Design a protein around this ligand. Structure first.
Ligand code: ATP
Ligand code: ADP
Ligand code: MG
Ligand code: MG
Lengths: 495, 69, 467, 48, 57, 68
């Protein structure tokens, strides 16, 4: 009872500058009035809505609304706040779900923040940067061994609909728990997820999936669903990048994900056409390239004079009927540092996740990769490269052995869902395959062997894994041990 | 200030009630009962302090009992 | 409340000028001096005390200077438990010649979507008795379902089969909304629902309500019927605790009708002639058909693809609002396989081992892999011929061709013009029948014995007769 | 609870008299592996 | 867990209804005569407030 | 100047006296007296592009307690 009395217990009025509305329709308002108004400045309406001014013309100002427009009507009053649009920032936002402007929608309560930051800022130049040198681990076997990713990089995920793009990011987010539940702060990573254009129930299921694995304690979710106004979907990614930049400048590392960048361009096209600007190709605005180029340039690796922080990005794109030579995808292909391709034909042939290893690339050259993994992955590259060039015809000395090894190697890369692996276990499981210990078993039974052998190795040989983790490389004694373990378990495992 | 003090006075008037809202509401009790029933159905039926304790035997006991043993 | 004057009439767009008391957006207005009621809806505020509206009926006979009166609220329709067994229209007037509808309360068409904290995340399965759907892309309870297909491929036969199989045994209510379709089909549906017993004319035991606006109406009406159905669907979910089934026929006409007025409103067309606001106004309508912490709604929608094109902007933005997809193909229908469901292009959200079980999932993945492999040999067979293949390829070709036949099925609603008898298969029999074919136990039977039958036992008997 | 089991060599275990006992050993492999997996899955100490 | 959840739900419902009652009775209590007398007091107060604001060029 | 009820002419000339004080450098102010009873009570003043709102709009402020 007294709580509400104290809430109402805690009123000043002052002059303000004002314009009057001339017209209103379809979310665009024409305002007569305001004289000393800056470009890209936030204004406020009578009822409580908010807007931003983009067109400054001799006789009127064009204002876009951040919400519904059924309450604005001709003759109303508009005031100017005096500040360019900005969002709250800090580390009190961890574990919360907020909208595009930093308002809680999860029902917990107000957010106690002390800092604000603009959404449109410039990327770091040439001096404050340094090379990329540290690894970013995901838990996917086919990614950590053939398409490695460093800290400070940009990587593209591109494919058709219903191929598996979201689950890669969901698995990547979960894997980071084993580092955040530790001691040293030089190997922790924070995560940010941004949803653009999706429906609410999918986001609810995603949040429930995250909270049952104890991962919400270090994640931030920013959502602008399909029922929101176009300006909010247009503004959402920058509002999340500005939240990510806070960690980068204080010696910490962070990760950000933009889901369906293709759905921001449609909102930009809708917003621009209603402002009476001429169209272009497919009625897109004339500068859709500059919309993403200034966004994907803000991820960088800072040197020691500025702290040593970093920020990583993973955009997502969708293509129509597997057409990679369209308008929008070609723009974003030429900006990033690499891409991962997903296909339906591989999806229906039992290859899940459906990664096309013949086209996926990573322009880092394995500069940031553990020493142990290189020894067993550099040799798997050659095996698969030589397998692909022969084993597709729609002798025994060379050909039969080649595809006998290749069919075994393909089966090793398949993996389940919501279960990433540590690095050393992947090293062991690949070490078993590459050396030829499994060239006798029928390929149909490889997965059961993988599962049983992993469980046995985890339980009975916990001391061996620590050696590989601590040393970072294999040794003669370790190599001696592994052969005996593998041969004995293979002999005993025949069921 | 004037509106604030008026609302404070009315909040104190609300506090003057012996118990419950001034307007009990013909449907407030019905809505509360419906919500409680939905919560009970979703969470399952539970008694005040019932603590059952029943222990089963060993399931699928595997032995060496065989003709060749 | 206030009076205006008509200033311009062009097609289905009318402009009014108010001396005082400018009405707000989305209010309804009434025209004075007509035999039949005519209602207008406010859309824009132009300036100089003028508004631009959209009509809900024909606009022939209007003269500049005529009087228009204000109402003060959006369109309101009668809603309640007495709409069961009746037929309404866009603005809630009875068209079944049985008198007025006496309900206690009314409701407005336009509202807002449920918030984020009211969502439910439970998932179950729904059994339909059709082999392809249950085996490959099963449905769910309280989810959204869409049926894609061209013209003449069979969407409405499937909708009527689903009605016949599911609606009758349901314990809750049902709502059918028809947008932009044939009138004679509505008459047929009304008469057969009278005959079955769902609609009762002498008591209060009906369990369906009907709302219609067909393809003989001006575009203003066809852009607003689906919300009229949505309102009566939502009343049974919120005020009462009930499970509701909602059937919508050709929701594509909701989008097409909106682009016939975009040009008259003074906008720049975006792409293939569509209006710039195509995704936002679809998202506004779709987000209201959901399941909350007060009830459940199950949706079945039929969608149309122009000129057999799946990349058209209209059907390409509906994929993101569904939980299960069923795509129909003309090429399959040419070969005589009914229903013509494409097995390599249909998905569902609950196809995972931890919901449907391991065995079902393994069988589905095996049949999909076998189907995919046979598609990659078409170029060689089409030119060089069957003789160039090895033995294993011939075996895979024979097994895939046998599997394709067994996916067809006879429907009960098609018995009149096909000379067959309807069938209904349980789930276990389908799983076991596909396991047996995958295991090769029936390699000694002709491929023509697996055509238009139910359970697997009927294949051996038809093969035995066809010796 | 705490366990005290004896390590075995399955290579020599297969050498013991297998006549008319192959099925028993095949079942024993499954039981011995699966029970160990289940035991390792859950902590021996009582929950919190 | 069950009992705690039920009690919390009851608390939330009561808070919401009390807020609604207070606001509605504020609107109801405000009467035309109250408005006249309060508007006279406000004429004095707001004239002084305008003097205060105008004192700051 | 906008008000819910018609203010007295003596209060009107007092208001003119203080409004000229705000006007400072300029000419004779043009006063439009408007009586809108929609507001519960208060006073709304516009002077060029300046704008001060002192009316029953504070109910929204008191309603915001429910949010926080
Ligand atoms: N490794 C995997 N094993 C099994 N199923 C998988 C795997 N990866 C993805 N799937 C399944 O693939 C389907 C599609 O996955 P996902 O939701 O990631 O697709 P998407 O590319 O995001 O699609 P959309 O365009 O609809 O958003 C889901 O049913 C998911 O369970
Ligand atoms: N299951 C079926 N069995 C036999 N014929 C069918 C079946 N489904 C569709 N057809 C054919 O399609 C025609 C009806 O098409 P229709 O369902 O009206 O297509 P749409 O739903 O696209 O309008 C019928 O004349 C019939 O010949
Ligand atoms: Mg996705
Ligand atoms: Mg049809």
């Amino acid at each position: 009872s007294s709580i509400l009395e104290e809430r109402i217990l805690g009123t000043s009025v002052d002059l303000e500058e004002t314009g009057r509305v001339l017209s209103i329709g379809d979310g665009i308002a024409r305002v007569h009035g305001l004289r000393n108004v800056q470009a890209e400045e936030m204004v406020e309406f009578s009822s409580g809505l908010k807007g931003m001014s983009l067109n400054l013309e001799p006789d009127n100002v064009g204002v876009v609304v951040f919400g519904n427009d059924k309450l604005i009507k001709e003759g109303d009053i508009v005031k100017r706040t005096g500040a360019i649009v900005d969002v709250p920032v800090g580390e009190e936002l961890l574990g919360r779900v907020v909208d595009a402007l930093g308002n809680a929608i999860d029902g917990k309560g107000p957010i106690g923040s002390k800092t604000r930051r603009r959404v449109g800022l410039k990327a770091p130049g040439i001096i404050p940067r340094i090379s990329v040198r540290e690894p970013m681990q995901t838990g996917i076997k086919a990614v950590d061994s053939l398409v490695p990713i460093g800290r400070g990089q940009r990587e593209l995920i591109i494919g058709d609909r219903q191929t598996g793009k979201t689950s890669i990011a969901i698995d990547t987010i979960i894997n980071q728990k084993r580092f955040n539940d530790g001691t040293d702060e030089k190997k922790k990573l924070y995560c940010i997820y941004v949803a653009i254009g999706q429906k609410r129930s999918t986001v609810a299921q995603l949040v429930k999936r995250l909270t049952d694995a104890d991962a919400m304690k270090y994640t931030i979710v920013v959502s602008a669903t399909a029922s929101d106004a176009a300006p909010l979907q247009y503004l959402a990614p920058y509002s999340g990048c500005s939240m990510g930049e806070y960690f980068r400048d204080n010696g910490k590392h962070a990760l950000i994900i933009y889901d369906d960048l293709s759905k921001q361009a449609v909102a930009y096209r809708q917003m621009s056409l209603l402002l009476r600007r001429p169209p272009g190709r497919e009625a897109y605005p004339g500068d859709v390239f500059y919309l993403h180029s200034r966004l994907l340039e803000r991820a960088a690796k800072m040197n020691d004079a500025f702290g040593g922080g970093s920020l990583t990005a993973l955009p997502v794109i969708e293509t129509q009927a597997g057409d990679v030579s369209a308008y929008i995808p070609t723009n974003v292909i030429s900006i990033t540092d690499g891409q991962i391709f997903l296909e339906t034909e591989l999806f229906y042939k039992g290859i899940r996740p459906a990664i096309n290893v013949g086209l996926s690339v990573s322009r880092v050259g394995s500069a940031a990769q553990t020493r142990a993994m290189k020894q067993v992955a550099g040799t798997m590259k050659l095996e698969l490269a030589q397998y692909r060039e022969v084993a597709a015809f729609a002798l025994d000395a060379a050909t039969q052995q080649l595809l006998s090894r290749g069919v075994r190697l393909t089966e090793l890369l398949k993996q389940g869902q919501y279960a990433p692996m540590a690095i050393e276990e992947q090293v062991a499981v690949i070490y078993a395959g590459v050396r030829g210990y499994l060239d006798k078993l029928e390929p149909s039974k490889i997965t059961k062997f993988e599962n049983a052998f992993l469980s046995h190795v985890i339980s009975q040989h916990q001391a061996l894994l620590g050696k590989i983790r601590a040393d970072g490389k294999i040794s003669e004694e370790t190599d001696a041990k592994l052969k005996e373990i593998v041969t004995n378990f293979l002999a005993g495992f025949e069921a | 200030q004037k509106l604030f003090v008026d609302k404070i006075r009315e909040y104190r008037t609300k506090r003057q009630t012996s118990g419950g809202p001034v307007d009990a509401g013909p449907e407030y009790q019905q809505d509360l009962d419906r919500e409680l029933f939905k919560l009970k159905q979703m969470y399952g039926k539970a008694d005040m302090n019932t603590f059952p304790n029943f222990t089963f035997e060993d399931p699928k006991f595997e032995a060496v009992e065989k003709p060749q043993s | 409340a206030a009076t205006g004057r008509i200033v311009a009439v062009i097609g289905a767009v009318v402009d009014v000028q108010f001396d005082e008391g400018l009405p707000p957006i989305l209010n309804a207005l009434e025209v004075q001096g007509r035999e039949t009621r005519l209602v207008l809806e406010v859309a824009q505020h132009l300036g100089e005390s003028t508004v631009r509206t959209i009509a809900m009926d024909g606009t022939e006979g209007l003269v500049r200077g005529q009087k228009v009166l204000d109402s003060g609220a959006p369109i309101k329709i009668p809603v309640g438990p007495e709409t069961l067994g009746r037929i309404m229209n866009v603005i809630g007037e009875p068209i079944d010649e049985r008198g007025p509808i006496k309900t206690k309360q009314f409701a407005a068409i336009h509202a807002e979507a449920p918030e984020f904290m009211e969502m439910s995340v439970e998932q179950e399965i729904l059994v339909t008795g059709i082999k392809v759907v249950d085996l490959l892309a099963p449905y769910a309870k309280g989810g959204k379902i869409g049926l894609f297909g061209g013209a003449g491929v069979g969407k409405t036969v499937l909708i009527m089969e689903l009605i016949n199989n599911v609606a009758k045994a349901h314990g809750g209510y049902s709502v059918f909304a028809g947008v932009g379709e044939r009138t004679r089909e509505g008459n047929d549906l009304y008469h057969e629902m009278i005959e079955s017993g769902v609609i009762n004319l002498k008591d209060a035991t009906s369990k369906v309500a009907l709302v219609y606006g067909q393809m003989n109406e001006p575009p203003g009406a066809r852009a607003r019927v689906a919300l009229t159905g949505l309102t009566v669907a939502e009343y049974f979910r919120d005020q009462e605790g009930q499970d509701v089934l909602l059937f919508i026929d050709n929701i594509f006409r909701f989008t097409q009708a909106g682009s016939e007025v975009s040009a008259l409103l003074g906008r720049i067309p975006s792409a293939v002639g569509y209006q710039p606001t195509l995704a936002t106004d679809m998202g506004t309508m779709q987000e209201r058909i959901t399941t909350t912490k007060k009830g459940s709604i199950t949706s079945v929608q039929a969608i149309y693809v122009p000129a057999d094109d799946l990349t058209d902007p209209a059907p390409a933005t509906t994929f993101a609002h569904l939980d299960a997809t069923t795509v129909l193909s003309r090429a399959i229908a040419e070969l005589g396989i009914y229903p013509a469901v494409d097995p390599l292009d249909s998905t569902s959200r609950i196809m995972d081992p931890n919901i449907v079980g391991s065995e079902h999932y393994d069988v589905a993945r095996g049949v999909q892999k076998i189907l995919q492999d046979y598609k990659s040999l078409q170029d060689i067979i089409a030119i060089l011929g069957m003789d160039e293949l090895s033995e294993e390829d011939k075996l895979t070709v024979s097994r895939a061709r046998k599997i394709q036949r067994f996916l067809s099925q006879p429907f009960q609603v098609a018995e009149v013009f096909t000379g067959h008898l309807g069938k209904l298969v349980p789930l276990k029999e389908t799983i076991k029948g596909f396991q047996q074919i995958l295991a090769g136990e029936y390699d000694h039977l002709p491929e023509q014995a697996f055509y238009m039958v139910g359970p697997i036992e009927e294949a051996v008997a038809k093969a035995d007769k066809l010796a | 609870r705490k366990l005290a089991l004896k390590a075995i060599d399955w290579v020599a275990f297969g050498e013991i008299i297998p006549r008319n006992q192959k099925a028993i050993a095949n079942s024993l492999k499954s039981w011995n592996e699966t029970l160990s997996t289940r035991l390792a899955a859950l902590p021996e100490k009582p929950p919190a | 867990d069950y009992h705690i959840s039920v009690q919390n739900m009851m608390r939330q419902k009561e808070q919401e209804h009390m807020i609604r009652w207070v606001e509605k009775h504020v609107v109801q209590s405000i009467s035309a005569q109250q408005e006249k007398e309060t508007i006279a007091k406000c004429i004095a107060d707001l004239k002084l407030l305008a003097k205060k604001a105008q004192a700051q060029p | 100047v906008t008000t819910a009820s018609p203010l007295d002419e003596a209060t009107l000339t007092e208001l003119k006296t203080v409004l000229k004080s705000f006007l400072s450098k300029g000419q004779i102010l043009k006063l439009e007296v408007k009586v809108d009873p929609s507001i519960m009570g208060g006073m709304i003043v516009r002077i060029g592009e300046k704008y001060v709102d002192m009316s029953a709009k504070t109910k929204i402020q008191k309603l915001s307690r429910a949010m926080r």
